[PDB]
Amino acid sequence: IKQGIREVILCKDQDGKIGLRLKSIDNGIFVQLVQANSPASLVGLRFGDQVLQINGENCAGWSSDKAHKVLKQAFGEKITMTIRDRPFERTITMHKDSTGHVGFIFKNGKITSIVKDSSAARNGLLTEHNICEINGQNVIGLKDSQIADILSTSGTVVTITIMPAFIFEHIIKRMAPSIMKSLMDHTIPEV
16 A cells, blocks of 8 residues: 555546446545456556546545546546545555464454464454455455455465455445445456
């Protein structure tokens, strides 16, 4: 999670979509969902990113409805967005032990207990935090079994991106579990 602000540039696809949903939080605008194979995924937008400007206009105070309406009414050719990188999230690096554990329990993606003398404990992983990404892969909407699988198939080094549950629960409201599972980008970034 890099601290400053970056500019991204998008073209709407042939359907007129960029593959984003946006949510008003605390008078900012935040990314609620990025679609796979979308102009938004290709330019590197992520769940939890803050959108500061769209085409040079400040997003402060916009409702979700107004942010979506502005995207729809932009000429599709070139859309500039100014982005602050996942401001409500933090990344924790852990090492698996010999038994292949990092040292926590989770349920519905939310960390619920930290195991004593684990890497999780040494690095100060917290409970009541939702898992957002693992090694830069978005895992929002995946079943717990699939998140466990990704943890096994990772190297010894495991980086987890987490968000306080109360903020996470606010970002994902008005968005059905089946959209998060099917449509949220879960790919590894392309080069």
